[PDB]
C-alpha cells in the first residue's frame, strides 16, 4: 500500500546545459576531486549524485563500444 510516494522532480534528462559542462569536467578529468564535483554539482544546478552518476554511465560505454580488449567471452541466454 502506497504510503505517501509525493514530491515533484525537476528533470529527468540533462539539459544541454548541464552537459556542455559535465562532459567539460569529464574531457580535462575523468576522475574529479570532491571540490571539482560540488562545484559542478552546485553551477549545473544538480545533485553531487548525479553527476558521479553521468560519469559511470558515461564511461562504462567504453565496453559496449565493443572495446578492442580480448578476455575471452561467455554466453546469454534468455529467460521466460
Do not use: H
Not at 571539482?36 to 552546485?42: D, I, S
Amino acid at each position: 500500500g502506497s504510503s505517501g510516494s509525493s514530491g515533484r522532480r525537476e528533470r529527468t534528462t540533462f539539459t544541454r546545459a548541464q552537459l556542455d559542462v559535465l562532459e567539460a569536467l569529464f574531457a580535462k578529468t575523468r576522475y574529479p576531486d570532491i571540490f571539482m564535483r560540488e562545484e559542478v554539482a552546485l553551477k549545473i544546478n544538480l545533485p553531487e549524485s548525479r553527476v558521479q552518476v553521468w560519469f559511470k554511465n558515461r564511461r562504462a560505454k567504453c565496453r559496449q563500444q565493443q572495446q578492442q580488449q580480448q578476455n575471452g567471452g561467455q554466453s546469454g541466454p534468455s529467460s521466460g
